């Protein structure tokens, strides 16, 4: 099973530096090309760099040349992107991918991606508030309840319900940037009205940039 | 550099329809074009490579073709799980470049939203800010007007909406509208109401509460 | 600029798809017609009816 896993993404100030890693498994990077590709509101999908670890040859996008360097350690089966002199327009999801694997001339495996946010604003953990079920959140014998995850920076936060046991009927809304420059989102789920008071409902909130982990019990 | 011009940017079809997405290279790229799918919260996933070849494990309803500098992705029988953004990419010359994408959505029958309202929690109120949440659940189509009224006065500039992407199971949308006030302002008033207008409702629906009522 | 040309694609069997083309008015127009022409191969000769000063199109295919 071929897998690529990116890490190292995070909040960084303009002009600052960051180093991303791309850990490969289920194949050897010595047998393929490895690319970095990023994705942003401004430019959509934009190729960043590539390397052929077998011989060390590299190529870069004009927009990052001199500021970013790609490298690979075949002994750890891992590729890296050093990112210096960072700017607002470098904010993006950064993916690593392979090309030419098993002789397929396309990017056939991509990692989950790692978020780089270039900003002068400070990290802030969210407050998590109950969205309690009530007579105003129920109809047809179903009830809605949730958690409001308010005032954090930067993205992302993750929300799960009952440790991932509860997935049916869950809507976690896309984050919205408030005027304060902080993000907020709600996650809601709809459940049988009759289960309220007998079945426990907990939203598990994680905001890794601030090391915030909250498990909030939501009650009638 | 070579650019890839993708059209249309948005396409909506019914389940089982044949849909066509196109990509035009700004100069000859031979057959060096791949197509990727990107689902909500996902990474790009290879569908077709070298213009016309199906990647392993990709459903046979996906096919690609080339005519000169024109590339076409066809989905022969659109399925609910096919809703995603689709991108072409050329690898003929460096830099490899991608198209701007095409968003594919499903058409289904009209469904009115379930409307719910949540007053600020007691926890939140302790901190000087009040968030009131209006929830529109599992509706179609996406268009919907949500207005806030506080003691019957229409609110403006103090609410924000978030809308899920289309659900890959039931093809519906959900939407939250959040009204933000200071604790003091929230305590100045009694009646909080969210009013929803949607094609599936015979007339607009108001969902409300009186601050303090259990 | 940046307008959205909204298009109804009306196939001979009565099935209907909808599309948007974005760009300058001129670019978006060109792409809508180009797309129409492409669909016409599989779906028969097209006719395009312009509505709202060119910003909306109903495009029917003969079969």
């Amino acid at each position: 099973e071929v897998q690529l896993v990116e890490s190292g993404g995070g909040l960084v100030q303009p002009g600052g530096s960051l180093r991303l890693s791309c850990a490969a498994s289920g194949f050897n990077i010595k047998d393929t090309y490895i690319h970095w590709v990023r994705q942003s509101p401004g430019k959509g999908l934009e190729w960043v760099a590539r390397i052929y670890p077998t011989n060390g040859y590299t190529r870069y996008a004009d927009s990052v040349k001199g500021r970013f360097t790609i490298s690979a350690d075949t002994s750890k089966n891992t590729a890296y992107l050093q990112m210096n002199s960072l700017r607002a327009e470098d904010t993006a999801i950064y993916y690593c991918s392979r090309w030419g694997g098993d002789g397929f001339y396309a990017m056939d495996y991509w990692g989950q991606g790692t978020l780089v946010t270039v900003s002068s604003a400070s990290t802030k953990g969210p407050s998590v508030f109950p969205l309690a079920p009530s007579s105003k959140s129920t109809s047809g014998g179903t009830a809605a309840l949730g958690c409001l995850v308010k005032d954090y920076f930067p993205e992302p936060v993750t929300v799960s319900w009952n440790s991932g046991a509860l997935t049916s009927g869950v809507h976690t809304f896309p984050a919205v940037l408030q005027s304060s420059g902080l993000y907020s989102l709600s996650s809601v789920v709809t459940v049988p009205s009759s289960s309220l008071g007998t079945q426990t409902y907990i939203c598990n909130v994680n905001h890794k940039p601030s090391n915030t982990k909250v498990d909030k019990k939501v009650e009638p | 550099d070579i650019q890839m011009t993708q059209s249309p940017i948005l396409l909506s079809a019914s389940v089982g329809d044949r849909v066509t997405i196109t990509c035009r290279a700004s100069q000859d790229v031979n057959t060096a074009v791949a197509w990727y799918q990107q689902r909500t919260n996902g990474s790009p996933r290879l569908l077709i490579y070298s213009a016309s070849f199906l990647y392993s494990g990709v459903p046979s309803r996906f096919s690609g073709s080339r005519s000169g500098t024109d590339f076409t992705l066809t989905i022969s029988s659109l399925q609910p799980e096919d809703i995603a953004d689709y991108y072409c990419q050329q690898h003929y010359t460096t830099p490899p470049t991608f198209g701007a994408g095409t968003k594919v959505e499903i058409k289904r029958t009209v469904a009115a939203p379930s409307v719910f309202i949540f007053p600020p929690s007691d926890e939140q109120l302790k901190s000087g800010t009040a968030s009131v949440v209006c929830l529109l659940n599992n509706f179609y189509p996406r268009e919907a007007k949500v207005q806030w009224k506080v003691d019957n006065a229409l609110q403006s500039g103090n609410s924000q909406e978030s809308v899920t992407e289309q659900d890959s199971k039931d093809s519906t949308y959900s939407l939250s509208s959040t009204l933000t006030l200071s604790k003091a302002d929230y305590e100045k008033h009694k009646v909080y109401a969210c009013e929803v207008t949607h094609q599936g409702l015979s007339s607009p629906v108001t969902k409300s509460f009186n601050r303090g009522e259990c | 600029s940046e307008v959205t040309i909204k298009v109804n694609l009306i196939f001979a069997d009565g099935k209907i798809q909808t599309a948007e083309f974005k760009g300058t008015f001129e670019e978006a127009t060109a792409e809508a017609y180009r797309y129409a022409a492409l669909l016409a191969k599989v779906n028969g000769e097209y006719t395009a009816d312009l509505e709202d000063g060119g910003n909306h199109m109903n495009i029917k295919f003969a079969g």
């Binding site: 993006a92 993205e155 896309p174 984050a175 | 953004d85 701007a100 | -």
Partner: peptide, 12 residues
């Protein structure tokens, strides 16, 4: 339509 970082989807 523009790519959105939170959803990883084009927003129209």
């Amino acid at each position: 339509c523009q790519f959105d970082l939170s959803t990883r989807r084009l927003k129209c």
